[PDB]
Design a protein around this ligand. Structure first.
Ligand SMILES: [Ca+2]
Ligand SMILES: [Ca+2]
Length: 157
């Protein structure tokens, strides 16, 4: 295929009394090399910067030897007023660190472009490139509902 990077759960409930929450990411079935998957915390109704939570935007490094992955996010103690709040974890465009030399041939303008994420919506030609790159899996969205300490299994949807 290319890459299958999806969350095991699209919604996760974590306590506000927790330190680090970790979420399981499923790895590509074509793990034959090193692939970088950037991710970021969309604040939403939470506040990053160590305010309400410790926001994170970095890169998950997948390898042939490195299996699975967890996004480790730090939750902070409330600074403003307390509510159950939530932040979205989304991953970006994965890229092969080992850039596959696909022999297309000499072409005009071969620079470091390809900086756009998964965005081939109207541009069909960018799909050619995305086809030779890894992409995401099924559901890439993680709604982390950080529920203030009560008890778990209570917030059932
Ligand atoms: Ca707060
Ligand atoms: Ca709180």
């Amino acid at each position: 295929h290319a890459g299958i990077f999806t969350f095991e759960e699209p919604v996760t409930h974590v306590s506000e009394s927790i330190g680090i929450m970790e979420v399981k990411v499923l790895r590509t079935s074509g793990a034959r090399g090193n692939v970088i998957v950037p991710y970021k915390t969309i604040e939403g109704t939470a506040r990053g910067g160590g305010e309400d939570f410790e926001d994170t935007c970095g890169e998950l490094e997948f390898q042939n030897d490195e299996i699975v992955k967890t996004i480790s996010v730090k939750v902070i103690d409330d600074e403003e007023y307390e509510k159950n709040k939530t932040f979205f974890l989304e991953i970006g465009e994965p890229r092969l660190v080992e850039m596959s030399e696909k022999k297309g041939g000499f072409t005009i303008t071969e620079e470091y472009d390809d900086k756009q994420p998964l965005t081939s919506k109207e541009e069909e030609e960018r799909r050619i490139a995305e086809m030779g790159r890894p992409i995401l899996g099924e559901h890439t969205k993680l709604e982390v509902i950080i529920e203030e300490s009560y008890e778990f299994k209570s917030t059932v949807d």
